[PDB]
Design a binder for this molecule. Structure first.
Ligand SMILES: C/C=C(/C)CC/C=C(\C)CCC=C(C)C
Length: 147
């Protein structure tokens, strides 16, 4: 048990994702909402998303998170897994987080082009890794269903 393992566990304990939503970047139309904290590790989260998001060239994501702990360089690494095979990897940087602050984090996700929704549905896991700089804070997973 190292000082960094301890710091990582202090940030996670102080961390909470309050709400999240996806809109078609193009129209700004709201595709998916939810207030379930999908960043919580150790449990497989589920999300039923409209299969039209696969057609979106870009989707605008809003993350609303609270953090008791100060973070130097808060960033995300998200790997798109199809049947255990990584097809994509996104990188997002928020940067400095003020201790005991609530923050809205707007990220624009750019499209791959895609296998049809019917093939992908329930076979896609989004593996989100939660970093402060190069310190891994948490690893969480969400299984996607396209409806
Ligand atoms: C199929 C491609 C997409 C654009 C879906 C995006 C899904 C998410 C953003 C859920 C991941 C959860 C978080 C903790 C951010």
């Amino acid at each position: 048990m190292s000082a960094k393992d301890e710091r990582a566990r202090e940030i996670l304990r102080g961390f909470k994702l309050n709400w999240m939503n996806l809109r078609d970047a193009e129209t700004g139309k709201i595709l998916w909402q939810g207030t379930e904290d999908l960043s919580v590790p150790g449990v497989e989260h589920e999300a039923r998303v409209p299969k039209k998001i696969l057609k979106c060239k870009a989707v605008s994501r809003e993350l609303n998170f609270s953090s008791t702990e100060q973070m130097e360089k808060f960033r995300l690494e998200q790997k798109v897994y199809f049947k255990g095979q990584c097809l994509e990897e996104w990188f997002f940087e928020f940067g400095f987080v003020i201790p005991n602050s609530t923050n809205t984090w707007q990220s624009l996700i750019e499209a791959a082009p895609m296998m049809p929704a019917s093939v992908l549905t329930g076979n896609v896991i989004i593996e989100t890794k939660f970093f402060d700089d190069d310190l891994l804070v948490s690893t969480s997973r969400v299984r996607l269903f396209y409806v």
